[PDB]
C-alpha cells in the first residue's frame, strides 16, 4: 500500500474505534493502524519529494510515525485488557499528532 492508502486505513479505523462496541473490534482496528503507520513510515510525502531522503525533514516525518506507533502500542495494551473505553480515549488522542504532522508535510 502507498502513503495515501495507509492514511485512509488510519482514518477509517479511527472512525471504527469510536463506533466500536467491544474490545475485539478495537484490537483489530489498532492492529491494522499499527501496520499502516509502520508502512507509511517507509514512504516519501509529495511535499518532501524534492528533498533528500536523508534530509532533516524526512527524518522528522519518520520520527512522527515512531511516536504514533508508541501511542498505538499503549492503546493496544488497554484493548488487550478489555478496556475499550480507555482504548477509545487513547485512540482519540492520536488526532493531535495526526494534525501536527499534516500541518508540516501534508
Ligand atoms: C506524519 C508522520 C503523519 C502523521 C502522524 C499522520 N499523517 Fe496523514 N498524511 C501525512 C502526509 C504527508 C499526507 C499526504 C500524503 C499524500 O500522498 O498526499 C497525509 C494524508 C492523510 C489523509 C489524506 C489521504 C489522501 O488521499 O491524501 C488522511 C485522511 C490522513 N492523512 C489521515 C491521518 C490520520 C487519521 C492520522 C492519525 C492516525 C494521520 N493521518 C497521521 C502525514 C501524516
Ligand atoms: Ca506498501
Ligand atoms: Ca490524495
Ligand atoms: Ca492507492
Ligand atoms: Ca486509496
Ligand atoms: Ca456501533
Ligand atoms: Ca486486567
Ligand atoms: Cl470498557
Ligand atoms: Co504524544
Curated annotation (Swiss-Prot):
GO CC terms of this entry: periplasmic space
Subunit structure comment from the entry: Monomer.
Example GO molecular function: iron ion binding
Function in brief: Electron-transport protein of unknown function.
Source organism, top-level taxon: Bacteria
GO biological process: electron transport chain
Cofactor binding, note field: Binds 1 heme b (iron(II)-protoporphyrin IX) group per molecule.
Protein name, as recorded: Soluble cytochrome b562
Residues reported in the UniProt entry to bind heme b: 7, 102
Keyword entries, A-Z: Electron transport, Heme, Iron, Metal-binding, Periplasm, Signal, Transport
Similarity comment: family membership: Belongs to the cytochrome b562 family.
Localization per Swiss-Prot or TrEMBL: Periplasm
Cofactor(s) listed in the protein's UniProt record: heme b
Gene behind the chain: cybC
Region named Disordered: 38-60
Chain segments annotated as coiled-coil in the UniProt record: none
Main location as per UniProt: periplasm
Comp. bias intervals (Basic and acidic residues): 47-60
Annotated S-S bridges: none
